[PDB]
PDB file of C-alpha atoms in Angstrom:
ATOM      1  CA  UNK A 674     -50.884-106.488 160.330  1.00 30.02           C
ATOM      2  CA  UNK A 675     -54.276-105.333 159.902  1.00 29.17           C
ATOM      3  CA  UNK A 676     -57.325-106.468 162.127  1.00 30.28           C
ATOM      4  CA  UNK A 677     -61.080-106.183 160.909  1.00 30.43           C
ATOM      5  CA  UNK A 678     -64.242-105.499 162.838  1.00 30.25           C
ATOM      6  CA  UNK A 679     -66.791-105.869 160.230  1.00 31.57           C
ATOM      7  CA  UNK A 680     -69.060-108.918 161.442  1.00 34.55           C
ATOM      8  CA  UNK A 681     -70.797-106.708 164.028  1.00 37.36           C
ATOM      9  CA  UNK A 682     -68.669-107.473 167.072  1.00 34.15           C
ATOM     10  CA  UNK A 683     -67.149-110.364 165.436  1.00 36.80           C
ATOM     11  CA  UNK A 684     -63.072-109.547 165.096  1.00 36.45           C
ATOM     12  CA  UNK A 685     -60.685-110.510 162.330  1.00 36.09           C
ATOM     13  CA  UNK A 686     -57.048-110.475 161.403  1.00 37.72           C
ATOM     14  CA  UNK A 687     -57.526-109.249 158.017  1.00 40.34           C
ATOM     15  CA  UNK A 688     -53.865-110.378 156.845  1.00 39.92           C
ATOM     16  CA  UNK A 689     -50.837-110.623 158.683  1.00 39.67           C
ATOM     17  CA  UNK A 690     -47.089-110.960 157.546  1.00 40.97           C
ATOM     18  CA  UNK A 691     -44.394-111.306 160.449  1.00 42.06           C
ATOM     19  CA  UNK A 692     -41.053-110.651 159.435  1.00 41.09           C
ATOM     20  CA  UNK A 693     -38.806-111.877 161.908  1.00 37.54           C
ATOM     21  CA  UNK A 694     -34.884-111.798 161.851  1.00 33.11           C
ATOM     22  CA  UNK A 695     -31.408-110.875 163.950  1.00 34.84           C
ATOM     23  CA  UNK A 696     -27.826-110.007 163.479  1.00 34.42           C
ATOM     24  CA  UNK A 697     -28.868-107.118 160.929  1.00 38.12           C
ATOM     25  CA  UNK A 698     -26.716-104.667 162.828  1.00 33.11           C
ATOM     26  CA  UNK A 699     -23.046-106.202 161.577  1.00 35.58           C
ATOM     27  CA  UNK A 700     -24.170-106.333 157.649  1.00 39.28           C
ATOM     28  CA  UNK A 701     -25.991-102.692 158.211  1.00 41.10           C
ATOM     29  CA  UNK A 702     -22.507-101.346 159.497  1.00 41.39           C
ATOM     30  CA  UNK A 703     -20.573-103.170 157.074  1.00 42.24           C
ATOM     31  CA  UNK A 704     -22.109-101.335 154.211  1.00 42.96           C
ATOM     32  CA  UNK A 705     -22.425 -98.201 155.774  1.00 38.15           C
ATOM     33  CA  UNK A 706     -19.632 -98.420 158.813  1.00 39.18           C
ATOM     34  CA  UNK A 707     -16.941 -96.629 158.883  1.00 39.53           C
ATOM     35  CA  UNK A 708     -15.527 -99.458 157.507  1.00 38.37           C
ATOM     36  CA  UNK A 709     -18.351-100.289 155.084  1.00 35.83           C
ATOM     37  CA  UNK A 710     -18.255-101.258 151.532  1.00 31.74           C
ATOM     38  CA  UNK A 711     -20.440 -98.250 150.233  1.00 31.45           C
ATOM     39  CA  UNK A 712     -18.400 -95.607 152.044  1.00 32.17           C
ATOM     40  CA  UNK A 713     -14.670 -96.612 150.786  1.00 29.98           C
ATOM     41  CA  UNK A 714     -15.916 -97.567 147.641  1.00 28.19           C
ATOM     42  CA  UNK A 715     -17.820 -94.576 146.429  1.00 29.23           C
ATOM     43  CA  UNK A 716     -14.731 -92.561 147.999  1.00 31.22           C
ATOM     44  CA  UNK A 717     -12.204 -94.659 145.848  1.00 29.73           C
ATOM     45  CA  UNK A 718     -14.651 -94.674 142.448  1.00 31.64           C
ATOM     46  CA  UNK A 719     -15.268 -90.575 142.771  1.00 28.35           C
ATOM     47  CA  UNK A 720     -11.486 -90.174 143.047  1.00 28.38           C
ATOM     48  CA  UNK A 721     -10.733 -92.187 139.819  1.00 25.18           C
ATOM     49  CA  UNK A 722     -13.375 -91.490 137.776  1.00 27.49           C
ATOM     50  CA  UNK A 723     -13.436 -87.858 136.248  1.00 28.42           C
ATOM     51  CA  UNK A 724     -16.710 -85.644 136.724  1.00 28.54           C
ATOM     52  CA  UNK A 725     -19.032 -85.010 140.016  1.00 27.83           C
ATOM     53  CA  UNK A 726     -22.182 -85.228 140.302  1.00 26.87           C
ATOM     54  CA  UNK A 727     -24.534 -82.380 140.969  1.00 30.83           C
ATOM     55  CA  UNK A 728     -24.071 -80.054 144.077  1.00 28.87           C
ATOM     56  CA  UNK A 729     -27.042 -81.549 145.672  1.00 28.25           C
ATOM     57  CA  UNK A 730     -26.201 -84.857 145.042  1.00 28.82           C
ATOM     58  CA  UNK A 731     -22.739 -84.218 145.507  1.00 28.14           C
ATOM     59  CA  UNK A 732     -23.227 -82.792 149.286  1.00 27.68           C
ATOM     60  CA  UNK A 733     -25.229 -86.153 149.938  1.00 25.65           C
ATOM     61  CA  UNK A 734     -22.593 -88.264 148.697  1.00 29.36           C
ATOM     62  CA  UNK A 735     -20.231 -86.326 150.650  1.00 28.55           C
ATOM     63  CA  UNK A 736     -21.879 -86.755 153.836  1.00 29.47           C
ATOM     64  CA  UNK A 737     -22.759 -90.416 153.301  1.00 31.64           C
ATOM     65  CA  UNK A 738     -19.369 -91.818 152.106  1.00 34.65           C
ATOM     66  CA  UNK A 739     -17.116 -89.673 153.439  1.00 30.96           C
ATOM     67  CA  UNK A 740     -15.740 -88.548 149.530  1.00 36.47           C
ATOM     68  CA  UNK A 741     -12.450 -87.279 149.313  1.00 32.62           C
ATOM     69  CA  UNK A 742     -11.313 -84.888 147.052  1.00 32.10           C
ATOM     70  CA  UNK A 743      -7.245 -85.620 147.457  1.00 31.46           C
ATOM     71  CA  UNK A 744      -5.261 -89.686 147.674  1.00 31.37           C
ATOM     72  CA  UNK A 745      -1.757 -89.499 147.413  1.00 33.08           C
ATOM     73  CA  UNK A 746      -2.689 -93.327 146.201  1.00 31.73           C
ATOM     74  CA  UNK A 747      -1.410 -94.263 142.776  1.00 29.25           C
ATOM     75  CA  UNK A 748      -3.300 -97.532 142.842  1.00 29.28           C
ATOM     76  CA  UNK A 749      -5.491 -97.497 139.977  1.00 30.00           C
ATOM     77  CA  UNK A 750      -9.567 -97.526 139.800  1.00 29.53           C
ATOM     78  CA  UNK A 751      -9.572-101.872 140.095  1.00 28.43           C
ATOM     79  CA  UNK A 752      -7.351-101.732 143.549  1.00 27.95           C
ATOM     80  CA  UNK A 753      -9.610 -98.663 144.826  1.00 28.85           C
ATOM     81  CA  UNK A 754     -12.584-100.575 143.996  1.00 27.54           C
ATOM     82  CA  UNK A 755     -10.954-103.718 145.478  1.00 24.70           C
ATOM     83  CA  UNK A 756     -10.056-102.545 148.826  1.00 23.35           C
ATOM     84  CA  UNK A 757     -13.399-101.926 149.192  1.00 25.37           C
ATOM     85  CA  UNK A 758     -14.215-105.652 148.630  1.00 26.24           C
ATOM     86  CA  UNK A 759     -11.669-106.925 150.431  1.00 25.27           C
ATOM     87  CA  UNK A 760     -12.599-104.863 153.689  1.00 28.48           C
ATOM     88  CA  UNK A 761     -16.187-106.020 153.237  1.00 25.52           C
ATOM     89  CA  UNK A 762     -15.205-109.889 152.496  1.00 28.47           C
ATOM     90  CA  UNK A 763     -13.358-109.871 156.188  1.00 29.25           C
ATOM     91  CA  UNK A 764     -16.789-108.008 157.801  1.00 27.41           C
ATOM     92  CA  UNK A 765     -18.794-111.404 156.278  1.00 25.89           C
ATOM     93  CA  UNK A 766     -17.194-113.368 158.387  1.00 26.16           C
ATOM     94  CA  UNK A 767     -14.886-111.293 161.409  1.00 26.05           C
ATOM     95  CA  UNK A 768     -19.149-111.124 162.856  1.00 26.64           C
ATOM     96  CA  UNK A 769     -23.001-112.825 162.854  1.00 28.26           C
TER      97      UNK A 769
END
């Protein structure tokens, strides 16, 4: 919001948009809870897919997601990617 004061003492809202909204929290946490899409995913897709990213991406990533380097999981890059979306299909609903 912006308000004007341009018609001597005259005021006036310029422009105004009001963005109003609840029950962000759940969705925020289920992409980036501990149980979160993002996290579990880009954990499951660095572990199948060869290569890392650069160091200063890769200590982002690290701290973000939670990467890690060893899964005793022989489960294939479609089930680690899958989990993922199952875990976030029950947070859509298990909340607001």
């Amino acid at each position: 919001k912006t308000t004007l004061t341009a018609f001597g003492f005259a005021s006036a809202d310029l422009i105004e948009i009001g963005l109003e909204g609840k029950g962000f929290e759940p969705t925020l946490e289920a992409l980036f809870g501990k149980q979160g899409f993002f996290p579990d995913s880009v954990n499951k897709a660095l572990y199948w897919v060869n290569g890392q990213v650069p160091d200063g991406v890769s200590k982002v990533l690290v701290d973000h997601f939670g990467y890690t380097k060893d899964d005793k999981h022989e489960q294939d890059m479609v089930n680690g990617i899958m989990l993922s979306v199952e875990k976030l299909i029950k947070d859509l609903k298990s909340k607001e």
